[PDB]
Write a protein that binds this ligand. Structure first.
Ligand code: A1EA6
Length: 323
């Protein structure tokens, strides 16, 4: 599968790290009009939380070069101008966050890509979360969205819980790290010393990938100045009586079976930085959860804000291509 990345921000760069390691994905090109090749190579090589790239990174006038692989670079403000057809690009991965609707991401198909994966929620493109609704994807869909990182954490867990005990209602909190203000006053305050309440649309987004949960979840976030690992805190009313031991067994079974690699499970005394670089969408913290009564429980799940999501992007890219 031949892929091109639009945008060299954190997501674009981690998607490239992951895709370079994928045996059946080949990174052909990168587009970003706001950076130079030497700055691209520098940003790809060094990462404050995911470490130096384990490999040789360099550049020339027309490429970024990684372990001898030459990746062509472009600086087109308008993606319709990109030589995707000329380069035989199968999937265009758009991580800019600005071509995230059907009419805008269409520019990549116009440029000659066969399909587009948007690494951000979309109001018009169908959203897919691996482990949740990827079997609903049909090969005639040419433009798809991978939803958000918080949605990717919450949705696989909410599906497991709802399938086994039934979710009647749920309220969610996410303790959310900085990495990713007339419109949002709290968020314009200094990150450094502050807990900063925020709204988040993840609990509603779950209603779009799990329609049976539509209208059953809402929540908010507390932003804090920590490494880019976040944690969801899901307080749910259940349909069926259960015990926490049974919740643990069901989640662990899903993590070891059908949701392997997407949903993780731990009983260790972890803290947020223990999940830097974790490729799971969601890591259930069995020891942090707490049940009060047979149908009332608090579930805790971790996620690396960028890395699990980027791994899912490449997962979706491969899935959409095999179709
Ligand atoms: C996941 C990264 C992320 O958490 N972004 C973010 C969400 C909410 C707030 Cl308040 C700030 C930052 C992700 O989906 O990134 C792609 C946009």
């Amino acid at each position: 599968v031949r892929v091109a990345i639009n945008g060299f921000g954190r997501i674009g760069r981690l998607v490239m790290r992951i895709a370079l390691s994928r045996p059946n994905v080949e990174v052909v090109a990168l587009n970003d009009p706001f950076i130079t090749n030497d700055y691209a190579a520098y940003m790809f090589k060094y990462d404050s939380t995911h470490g130096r790239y384990a490999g040789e990174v360099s550049h020339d006038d027309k490429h970024i070069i990684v372990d001898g692989k030459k990746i062509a670079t472009y600086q087109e403000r308008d993606p319709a101008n990109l030589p995707w057809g000329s380069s035989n690009v199968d999937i265009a991965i758009d991580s800019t966050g600005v071509f995230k609707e059907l009419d805008t991401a269409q520019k990549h198909i116009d440029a000659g890509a066969k399909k587009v994966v948007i690494t951000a929620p979309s109001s018009t493109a169908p959203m897919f979360v691996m482990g949740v609704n990827e079997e609903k994807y049909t090969s005639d869909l040419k433009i798809v969205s991978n939803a958000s990182c918080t949605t990717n954490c919450l949705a696989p867990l909410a599906k497991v819980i709802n399938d086994a005990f039934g979710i009647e209602e749920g309220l969610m909190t996410t303790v959310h790290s900085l990495t990713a203000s007339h419109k949002d006053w709290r968020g314009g305050r200094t990150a450094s010393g502050n807990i900063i309440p925020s709204s988040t649309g993840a609990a509603k987004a779950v209603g779009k990938v799990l329609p049976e949960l539509q209208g059953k979840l809402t929540g908010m976030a507390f932003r804090v100045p920590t490494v880019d690992v976040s944690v969801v805190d899901l307080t749910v009313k259940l349909n069926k009586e259960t015990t926490y031991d049974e919740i643990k067994k069901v989640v662990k079974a899903a993590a070891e079976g059908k949701l392997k690699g997407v949903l993780g499970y731990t009983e260790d005394a972890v803290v947020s930085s223990d999940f830097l670089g974790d490729s799971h969408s969601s890591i259930f913290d069995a020891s942090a959860g707490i049940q009060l009564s047979p149908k009332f429980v608090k579930l805790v799940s971790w996620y690396d804000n960028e890395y699990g999501y980027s791994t899912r992007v490449v997962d979706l890219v491969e899935h959409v291509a095999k179709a």
